[PDB]
Amino acid sequence: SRIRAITDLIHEIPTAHNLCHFKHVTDYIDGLCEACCIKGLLRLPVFTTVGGRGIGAGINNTPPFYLLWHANDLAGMLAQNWQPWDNMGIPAWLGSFQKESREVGLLAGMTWLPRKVYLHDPVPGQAACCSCGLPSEALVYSCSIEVEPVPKGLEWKDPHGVYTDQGKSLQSKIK
DNA sequence: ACATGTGTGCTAAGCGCACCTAATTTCCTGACGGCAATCCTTACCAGCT
Ligand SMILES: [Mg+2]
């Protein structure tokens, strides 16, 4: 039911702010290709912010600092960050996840869904890029978003996250 | 910012100072006043176009 602009999914592109104009963008007008939409959906479970204290965040109240091991190789990247935990979880690429008991696991929190995304496609679409830069085919128009209120409790520690001693997520301190 | 306009015709050398001397005390300020805003929302709802 709730429909927002697809430009708010990719946080770098300005959205329907409280302004008559934006940084030379306009919602429901500028196209966006499949690749950037799809790699912008990967930023939902891990980099979702507060939407005015009534719209919920991700598995953390604020997007935490992420510390992580880098390597020259993709095999080296995957191998150097292999530290597992005994819990399994339920990742979102399965169907509806089972709530069950608390401490849901690791693959469940890696693929947590704070917001439903459905998307919609009109009678074909565009003919060239207008916001991405890579000239693609008929692009998408807008996205659909809703809010899942994350239930209270849910004791969960992030493998890459940086956590305060009081349990709140640690945000970057740049103003 | 010496020279130079001499025009009968304009010198010149020796010589130029040493020494004692300069002080203290204390005094020195309290108080009151010190800016607010606005540069992303628990967002729908009702005054009315
Ligand atoms: Mg692209």
Automatic annotation (TrEMBL):
Mg(2+) 1 binds at C36, C129, C132. Zn(2+) binds at C36, C129, C132. Mg(2+) 3 binds at C129. Mg(2+) 2 binds at C36, C132. Transmembrane segments: none annotated. This is CRISPR-associated protein Cse1 (CRISPR_cse1). It comes from Candidatus Cloacimonetes bacterium ADurb.Bin088. The lineage of its organism: Bacteria, Pseudomonadati, Candidatus Cloacimonadota. The chain holds residues 183 to 357 of 535 of the full protein.
